[PDB]
Amino acid sequence: ASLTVKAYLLGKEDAAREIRRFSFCCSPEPEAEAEAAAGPGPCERLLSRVAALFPALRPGGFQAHYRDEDGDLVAFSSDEELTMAMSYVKDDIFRIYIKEKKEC
Amino acid sequence: ASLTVKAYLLGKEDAAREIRRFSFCCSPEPEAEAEAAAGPGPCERLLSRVAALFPALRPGGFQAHYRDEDGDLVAFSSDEELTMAMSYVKDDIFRIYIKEKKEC
Amino acid sequence: ASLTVKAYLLGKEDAAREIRRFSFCCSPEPEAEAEAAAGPGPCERLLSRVAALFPALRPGGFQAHYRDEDGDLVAFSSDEELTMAMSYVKDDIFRIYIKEKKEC
Amino acid sequence: ASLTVKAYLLGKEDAAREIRRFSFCCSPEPEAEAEAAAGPGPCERLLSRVAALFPALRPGGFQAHYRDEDGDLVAFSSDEELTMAMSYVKDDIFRIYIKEKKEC
Amino acid sequence: ASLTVKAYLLGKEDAAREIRRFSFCCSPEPEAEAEAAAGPGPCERLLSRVAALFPALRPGGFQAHYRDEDGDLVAFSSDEELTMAMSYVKDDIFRIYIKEKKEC
Amino acid sequence: ASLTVKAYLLGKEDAAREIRRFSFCCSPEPEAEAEAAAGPGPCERLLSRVAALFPALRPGGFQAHYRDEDGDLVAFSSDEELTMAMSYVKDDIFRIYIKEKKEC
Amino acid sequence: ASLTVKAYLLGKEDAAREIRRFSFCCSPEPEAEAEAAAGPGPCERLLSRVAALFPALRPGGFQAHYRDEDGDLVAFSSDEELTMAMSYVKDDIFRIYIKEKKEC
Amino acid sequence: ASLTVKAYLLGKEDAAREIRRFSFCCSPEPEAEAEAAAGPGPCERLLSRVAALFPALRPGGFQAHYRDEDGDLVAFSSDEELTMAMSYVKDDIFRIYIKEKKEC
Amino acid sequence: ASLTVKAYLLGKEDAAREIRRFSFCCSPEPEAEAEAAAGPGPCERLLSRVAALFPALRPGGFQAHYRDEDGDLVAFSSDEELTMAMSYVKDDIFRIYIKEKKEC
């Protein structure tokens, strides 16, 4: 399941500041034997890869979102919630919206 | 009865600060034998799951609401009152509105 | 006679601070034999249930009101006066307005 | 019954000088057999724990209060009066107000 | 007849120095047979309980008051006068005002 | 459990004078055998590390705080109270507020 | 690891008075044999080079800072804390903010 | 038990003339075998050390005090009374107040 | 351990009359063999150097102080007390306050 993720980085008034467009492999998985318990999570691997590409942000300091049917930026941080996020993929493009974690 | 809960977290002037959109299983129930008296309540399981997802709040320190026909944010904390809250579900989306418990 | 009571809790300048919306069973009554003299009163059961739901108030320390045709918050504390309060029900919603009993 | 006590230490013009926020276990009780007559009292265990946390005060030399509906700092020193103090708990936070015992 | 007594202890310029807020059982009475002539009086039981709570005063050395409609601190020491004092109870709170017996 | 502590040093009117931002390892612990009774405490190791970084203060002469839901600077000095302090961590940043111990 | 350091020298109201922009070689290191124990530290070499360039300050009399995600000038003086400072480098520019050590 | 003693030497109108701030080891004690009956007393070792530091006074000719909760300079000369003096230590600072023994 | 001593000479109303700012070498020590018993003391070498610089005072006729956390001028004359004085060094500046020994 080759899945393209188009990571929007949002700015001041929720206008996009930098777009990245990488590829992601959620349903694919490594070798079918346990070298660990079971890897990282599918949302933990996503946020580890969004943090690796953008130079403008550091890992652990950003909140990834998506747009639902109402147009609202629904956040996601879990991997049982990333599966609800990915039911909104249009063609193969999973558009996420990155916002940084400021003061309050 | 698969039931989607869209948890709005309200901010200063009752504008939404973070939206979460999880799924909830009120009328479904576990195995039909008593390992306890009868679990937690259906409102106790809801507020335990809203507190688990949001990192910005801690359990026991938030008031969950809903909108009635007048547009007012009617609060609910009981499980005989959650059944009146859930008679306002539109398609399968049960929109609740979270407010934190401040000074006075 | 299923009767919905929408309990407004009034604040500083008579603006609503918390709304509760429960159901009430005035004209319904229990088993048709005397285990007591005759229960509590229909206004005593109402104020015992408004005090049970709101965590922000304690029983015996609040005054329940209603709006008459002039727009004034007419208070009620009796059960021969609750019957005059309930002649203002609109559809099945009996809107009461709770005010706490402060210093003077 | 997990119960949070937020101990305000009052200063010169009844402004708070140090706040402590511990937890208290009034209605919980130890093993259901008598190793003594019946422990200390529930108010004696409270004032023994407020004195243990604050370094600025010594046991036997402080008066614990609470706010009633009038806004007045009602004192309490008994354990049949601590039960009237604890009917003012809001969520689970039992706010007491500590004042030291000076000259006159 | 559960009756709450809020005992104000007055200070120098009739400003309250310590407030106590206990409960009192005037119209309730013990077992309906004579183990004595008839107990203490209802004012004798009140002043015995106000003296038991306050550590700052000793029994027989304080004058309990109440406020009438004129705002004056009307004293009471009898139990045929305590019945006139208790016709000024507002909700269930019988506010008395304690003054100590000094030189002259 | 890698945990970032952002130590605010408060000044005259509780405005921050110097911020330090170190890392802390509360739930991690050394080798699983007793070279001592059990180390220092988790609050004793925290205050030993806050004192090591700031040159402007000396150990034993500062009071570490945190902000609760009311916005109040709740102090903590125990290690059964540091566990209640650390239930307010937002992302992984545990903001403490340092105040020095002056005259009175 | 060629790393550019842009040293802001702050003035009265934290406005920059002189900017210097040198280069720094933290992760690079000299010959792989011990002519000493291990050189100076990576923060000791940084503050020795900031003091060498600015004529307006003398070594040992300035506090180097950085901006975190909250916009606060977090100070650093250690070399286990300089490694947390350098996780905020944007492209290759490590912006530090110099403040002098005055009276109090 | 490392215990800091801040010895105020009082002057004419009980204003401090010279402050000394030494350290004291009351609860610590020497080798656990009797080379004597049991040393000097813990108050005898304190007054022998206050006399050793101040050049302005000679041993046997000064009265050491402390402040109680009333603000009064309570004197102490015994070692069963020094244990009541040391229940007023604030952080680890045991403030004593020295007065010399004049005519009458 | 290069240590800067800023010697304030106090005047009439404890206002500084002359400031000197020399350097001091407490923890450094001479050749590691005994040409004497062990030199002078570290406080004896300090007061011998403060007396050498100021022309306005003569040795043996001045009392050196320091400020503690309370703002009080704590005196020191011993070398087991100079080690408690030097735990208040801020950057490397050990501010002492010189007062001359007048009549009484």
Author numbering:
A (entry chain A), B (entry chain A), C (entry chain A), D (entry chain A), E (entry chain A), F (entry chain A), ...: 2 to 105
Copy text verbatim from the article accompanying this structure deposition:
Of the three PB1 assemblies studied, AtNBR11–94 (AtNBR1–PB1) and p621–122 (p62-PB1) formed homogeneous filaments of constant diameter that appeared best suited for high-resolution structure investigation by cryo-EM. Image classification of segmented PB1 helices revealed that both AtNBR1–PB1 and p62-PB1 polymerize in two different tubular morphologies: a projection class with a ladder-like pattern, we term L-type, and a projection class with a serpent-like one, we term S-type. For p62-PB1, we observed a four-stranded L-type assembly and a three-stranded S-type assembly. The L-type here has a pitch of 135.9 Å with 14.16 subunits/turn, and S-type has a pitch of 138.6 Å with 13.60 subunits/turn. Using the derived symmetries, we determined the 3.5/3.9- (L-type, p62/AtNBR1) and 4.0/4.4 Å- (S-type, p62/AtNBR1) resolution structures. All four structures form tubules of ~120 Å and 150-Å width with an inner diameter of 45 Å and 70 Å for AtNBR1–PB1 and p62-PB1, respectively. The overall fold of the asymmetric unit was found compatible with the NMR structure of the p62-PB1 monomer. The β1–α1 loop in p62 is flexible and only visible in the L-type assembly density. The main interactions are formed between a double arginine finger formed by two neighboring arginine residues in strand β2 (R19–R20AtNBR1/R21–22p62) stabilizing strong salt bridges to acidic residues (D60/D62/D64/D73AtNBR1 or D69/D71/D73/E82p62) in the OPCA motif located in the β2–β3 loop and the α2 helix. In addition to the canonical transverse interactions, the helices are further stabilized by longitudinal interactions Y14AtNBR1/N28AtNBR1 or K102p62/D92p62 and R59p62/D93p62 to subunits of neighboring strands along the helical axis.
PB1 domains are protein interaction modules with critical roles in the assembly of protein complexes involved in autophagy, signaling, cell division, and redox processes, as well as the auxin-response pathway in plants. PB1 domains form homotypic interactions via conserved electrostatic motifs molded by basic or acidic surface patches on opposite faces of their ubiquitin-like β-grasp fold. While type A and type B PB1 domains can form heterodimeric protein complexes, type AB members can mediate interactions with either PB1 domain type or engage in homotypic interactions to form homo-oligomers or hetero-oligomers. Our cryo-EM structures of filamentous p62 and AtNBR1–PB1 assemblies revealed that the presence of a tandem arginine sequence in the basic motif of type AB interfaces is required to stabilize a polymeric assembly.
